[PDB]
Amino acid sequence: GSPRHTVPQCCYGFCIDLLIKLARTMNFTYEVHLVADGKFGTQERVNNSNKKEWNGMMGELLSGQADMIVAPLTINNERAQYIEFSKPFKYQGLTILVKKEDSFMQPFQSTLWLLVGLSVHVVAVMLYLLDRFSPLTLSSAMWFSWGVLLNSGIGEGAPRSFSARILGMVWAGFAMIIVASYTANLAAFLVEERITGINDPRLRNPSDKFIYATVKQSSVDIYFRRQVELSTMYRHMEKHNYESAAEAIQAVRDNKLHAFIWDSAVLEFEASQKCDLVTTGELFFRSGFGIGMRKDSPWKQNVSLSILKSHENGFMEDLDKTWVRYQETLTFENMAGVFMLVAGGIVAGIFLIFIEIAYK
């Protein structure tokens, strides 16, 4: 993204106020720095001597560039045997984010519409030429040529068609069989979005419509890779690896996604913020999230007693009150483009009428 751009900015929120509570309980001075990447960290092999290493926060903790990981760390097999943990302060599960929300002119291919336009133009020109070579002339010819296609009723008459009534009747039947075939194949063309859990037979072999992904190199991806009986979903998620969660929110908002594995109360908070991201009533993977601590030291015991002090009172309840509890032919979304193109056609027609009045 950027070669070198790191500036002093302001950090606040949930984990920052948790660190302020830690500093209020027991005295310690600190310095908050941000990690360079946006990944949780996986057990990745290094390019020499067949060694598996970490990256991100664990890549800086074991190398001396970090001292304490203040993050929703997932307790699993790989991370518990390397560094010590603390009391899990967060109990939060996973769920699926979906989108609960007709090729008329603009999604439909525009070869035959211009073909009908050029066809009725050629018909009007040759009927005007036959009106010239008889066996407001042009205005009445255009009125007849656009009143045959009008198919709803117009106050016109009958032109002199002693050698042109066959062309008019074939053009009338031609226009009606075109609009009849168009109505028939649209009704045949336009005549299922939910996921609702990982135990779904429809997503055992997905396609280009069943779109679902996760955060690249995340602990949720590590837990899904540990589930060896979910290999096809792992194949589908590794092809749509997303770096940050904001890109996933932007993709699911712009109708590029259909499902996303994410934490439950955060998606409830986003449903409180945005009305277009409402999940289902499911809850799974209740994993405790705590603080990854250092080696044998009494300050680990001091941090553990501070977390126990945060558990024994209603400070987590106060954080839940200040963050979690604080809330805020369809012709609604499908025919919105229909409404926009019809309104644009109305504006263009009114403009042509005012130009016709101002000219004549």
Partner: protein
């Protein structure tokens, strides 16, 4: 030239293509917007016929593949369903779908006869039970309003047996007694003695109700135009 204040009828009669033709002026002004409204009426009737084609009494529960049991957010009426508490039915649900047990845990019940009273009075919407006993109870039900929807389509459809201890020598003789009981129709005789039970152009059965509502609305509009 009556299109001064009566343009509403002249614009709304160009949809169902049988209105009286009105003499348009020679300045080529009204015919363009008449053609635009005509094309809009054609595509509106096309969308209306498409909606009538996509619309195609029937039952509300299809089975395990129902569009309600996963999440009732799609449909407007909610529902509820439960099984026996801390029973083998809950484990049989958890052996196939844990999410079904998650939606069933919040909607639990107490007793099977209490669940039947709750279904008759309205304190329960659905109850998962054995289909043969429900057929036997619908054969003796007062009211004759229980037709069992589904009897083993995408259901379990399991059997029952005699479970002995691990290592009993009498189990082979019990198996021979069961083979004697099956191979003469005696088990089916017991099932007949104990278990029993008794009791197109017609698709517009609700469209005539809409004809009645539109006729009532037309009579109301005629009364409004008659009183003033």
């Amino acid at each position: 030239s009556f299109t001064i204040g009566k343009a509403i009828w002249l614009l709304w009669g160009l949809v169902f293509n049988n209105s009286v033709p009105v003499q348009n002026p020679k300045g080529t002004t009204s015919k363009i917007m008449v053609s635009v409204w005509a094309f809009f009426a054609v595509i509106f009737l096309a969308s209306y016929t498409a909606n009538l084609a996509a619309f195609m009494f029937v039952d509300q529960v299809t089975g395990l593949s129902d569009k309600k049991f996963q999440r009732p957010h799609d449909y407007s009426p909610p529902f509820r369903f439960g099984t026996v508490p801390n029973g083998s039915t809950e484990r049989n649900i958890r052996n196939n779908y844990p999410y079904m047990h998650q939606y069933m845990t919040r909607f639990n019940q107490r007793g099977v006869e209490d669940a039947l009273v709750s279904l008759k009075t309205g304190k329960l919407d659905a109850f998962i039970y054995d289909a043969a006993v429900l057929n036997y109870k619908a054969g003796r039900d007062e009211g004759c309003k229980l037709v069992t929807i589904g009897s083993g389509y995408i259901f379990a459809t399991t059997g029952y047996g005699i479970a002995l201890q691990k290592g009993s020598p009498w189990k082979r003789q019990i198996d021979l007694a069961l083979l004697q009981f099956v191979g003469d129709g005696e088990m089916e005789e017991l099932e007949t003695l104990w278990l029993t039970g008794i009791c197109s152009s017609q698709l517009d059965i609700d469209n005539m109700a809409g004809v009645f509502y539109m006729l009532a609305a037309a009579m109301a509009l005629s009364l409004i135009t008659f009183i003033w």
